[PDB]
């Protein structure tokens, strides 16, 4: 495969089956549903008819009163006492197969390549810890919203993008399938592509 850069204008030979392969849509949807559904902490709780602060004495007689039968004030048909199926804190975190995660990352790398969105550069870092430099610098390449993903993270580059909105600078260990779609361009170090070729495999 021919990853030609745009600044050094050099080829980069990677695995066709890893990188220039098919795009399975309904797998990528599965990993993004399972990932965003892994993002939920899900700390909801209501209370049933056994936690409402009340009593258990029947409000009135069973028979002879004109009113409908009722047995507890905590019943879920009454006001202020209720929630027949009250929800609890749960785990919405759902499991993927490992090969579907790695494979679907290979598929979205394929889709980012065939759309001329994924950008390979060589070693690409900032010089001083100042976001002013990254403003001109990402003005120059015409990069509005990116994923500056590198293989060696430092205090120089990461601090210079902690306050940019549309910029997220990750470690090549930590790419995730909602970012590689949720950014408009992606720019990579050649070392970062060198590692993602290994990890996705």
């Amino acid at each position: 495969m021919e990853l030609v850069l745009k600044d050094a204008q050099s080829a980069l030979t990677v695995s066709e089956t890893t990188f220039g392969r098919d795009f399975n849509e309904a797998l990528v949807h599965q990993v993004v549903v399972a990932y965003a559904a892994g993002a939920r902490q899900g700390t909801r709780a209501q209370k049933t008819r056994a936690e409402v602060t009340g009593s258990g004495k029947k409000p009135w007689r069973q028979k002879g009163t004109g009113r409908a039968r009722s047995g507890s004030i905590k019943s879920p048909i009454w006001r202020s006492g209720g929630v027949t199926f009250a929800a609890r804190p749960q785990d919405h975190s759902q499991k993927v197969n490992k090969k579907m995660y790695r494979g679907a990352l290979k598929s979205i790398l394929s889709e980012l390549v065939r759309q001329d969105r994924l950008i390979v550069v060589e070693k690409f870092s900032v010089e001083a810890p100042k976001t002013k430099l990254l403003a001109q610098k990402l003005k120059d390449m015409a990069l509005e919203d990116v994923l500056i993903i590198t293989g060696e993270l430092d205090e120089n580059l990461f601090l210079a993008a902690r306050n940019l909105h549309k910029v997220d600078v990750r470690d090549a260990t930590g790419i995730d399938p909602v970012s590689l779609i949720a950014f408009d361009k992606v720019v990579m170090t050649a070392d970062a592509v060198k590692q993602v070729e290994e990890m996705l495999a």
Partner: peptide, 14 residues
Amino acid sequence: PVYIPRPRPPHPRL
């Protein structure tokens, strides 16, 4: 109403 009285007894029929 808090106090609901016992209903007026039925006509026998037994």
